[PDB]
Design goal:
The complex is a heterodimer of chains A (298) and B (133). With 298 residues, chain A is of the alpha/beta class. Chain A is built from ten helices and 15 strands. Chain B has 133 residues and is α+β, with helices and mostly antiparallel strands. Classes of the chains: A alpha/beta (298), B alpha+beta (133). Bound molecules: manganese (II) ion (2 copies).
Chain lengths: 298, 133
């Protein structure tokens, strides 16, 4: 397993200049994938978590930002953590990021949780960096191994039966939570349907009801849809990610939905800051901001 | 009705690496190229793959290939009558050449595929893909 050895090496670059890589062995990574995969399937696809807890958004391979995320929020098991997906792609150190998160999940399965983002899908990360990073620093067989692990990540989490958490947002097909729980793993993320929307959909102020999403997949939803959703299921907040917000956090539909993003200066093309959410035993919510055609005969 | 609350206390702003300290840019990502490769890979997954082993004769392997998309796939256009491929019978027109001597020819460049097919010898090991019924 080498779990303590793996984590120690991953944290050894804390004080180095950012960009320095940590090269784990192929077998160690495969161990982390095969064992985290085992835990993911032993736990419900729809998580039921209890406070205290800290909620974080996209990372996208910005490994050192994840460290400062842990440094200020408290390394595990000092604090319980729930991530909303998008750990890989668009960054130069996705492998370090996902390994550290998977290691903590194996080490602290009941106090550390990871949700599936739209980039934890083979059809997407094959294009936006993770496959290339696996090919360069390992073999593509390792990328297939990450796919089998990602296909078993949980989709959504409900905190204290009152806060609903997922990467993307709501779906017009979502009537009861049993529709989520019936989803069987391992599964790819289809181009359409409930699972797709949970990982892709966005809130939009200018939309009444449902609307088409500029990403070319899934939909956009307005404030009324949020309020009705919370009313019908006796919830009071939707916590999600998947959109860059300049202040690391951003509310929507009064205080009924919040967007979290934990990758400062997203892929070096934004000014945005990162942020996280802390929920205590009394369900108090606070914000910590991480501000910087051919032929041939044979 | 609500059982949650929110904090009016000030917001804590911890500092983080600048852009000079931490260069988060990544110009290596090339979605256009990867997407072209991935589309070819998707088609192969839906194909019926079977092995084939041909012994080269005087004429060669008796196969004529065509590239189809940059990132190309290798398909059979002609099977010369009397050649090794025809006499074997398992290779037919429009069969994709997924692998040759263990080297993948899905989403490759014409230069790459030509180099591989020119370096074959004697008993060439093929992986052939055919459209499922
Ligand atoms: Mn996303
Ligand atoms: Mn994202």
């Amino acid at each position: 397993l080498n779990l303590d050895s793996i984590i120690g090496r991953l944290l050894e670059v804390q004080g180095s200049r950012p960009g320095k890589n940590v090269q784990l062995t192929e077998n160690e990574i495969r161990g982390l994938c095969l064992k985290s995969r085992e835990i993911f399937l032993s736990q419900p696809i729809l998580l039921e978590l209890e406070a205290p807890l800290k909620i974080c958004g996209d990372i996208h391979g910005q490994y050192y930002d994840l460290l400062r995320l842990f440094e200020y929020g408290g390394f595990p098991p000092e604090s319980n953590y729930l991530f909303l997906g998008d750990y890989v792609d668009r960054g130069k150190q996705s492998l370090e990021t996902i390994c550290l998160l998977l290691a903590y999940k194996i080490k602290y399965p009941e106090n550390f949780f990871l949700l599936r983002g739209n980039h934890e899908c083979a059809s997407i990360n094959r294009i936006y960096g993770f496959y290339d990073e696996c090919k360069r620093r390992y073999n593509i067989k390792l990328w297939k191994t990450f796919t089998d692990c990602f296909n078993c990540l949980p989709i959504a989490a409900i905190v204290d039966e009152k806060i609903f958490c997922c990467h993307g947002g709501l779906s017009p097909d979502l009537q009861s939570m049993e529709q989520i729980r019936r989803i069987m793993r391992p599964t790819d993320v289809p181009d359409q349907g409930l699972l797709c929307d949970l990982l892709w959909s966005d809130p939009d102020k200018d939309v009444q009801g449902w609307g088409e999403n500029d990403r070319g997949v899934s939909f956009t939803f307005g404030a009324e849809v949020v309020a009705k959703f919370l009313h019908k299921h006796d919830l009071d907040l939707i916590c999600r990610a998947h959109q860059v917000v300049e202040d690391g956090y951003e509310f929507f539909a009064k205080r009924q939905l919040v967007t979290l993003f934990s990758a400062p200066n997203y892929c070096g093309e934004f000014d945005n800051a990162g942020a996280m959410m802390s929920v205590d035993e009394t369900l108090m919510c606070s914000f910590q901001i991480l501000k910087p055609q051919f032929e041939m005969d044979i | 009705n609500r059982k949650i609350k929110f904090s009016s206390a000030p917001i804590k702003v911890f500092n983080t690496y600048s852009n000079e300290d931490y260069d988060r840019r990544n110009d290596e990502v090339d979605p256009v190229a990867a997407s072209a490769e991935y589309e070819l890979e998707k088609r192969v997954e839906k194909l019926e793959l079977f092995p084939v082993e041909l012994e080269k004769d005087e004429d060669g392997l008796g196969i004529s290939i065509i590239g189809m998309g940059e990132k190309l796939g290798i398909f059979v256009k002609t099977v010369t009558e009397g050649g090794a491929a025809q006499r074997d019978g398992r290779i037919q027109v429009n069969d994709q050449i997924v692998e040759v001597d263990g080297i993948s020819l899905v989403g490759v460049t014409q230069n790459f595929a030509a180099t591989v097919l020119r370096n074959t010898k004697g008993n060439v090991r093929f992986v052939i893909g055919r459209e499922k019924p």
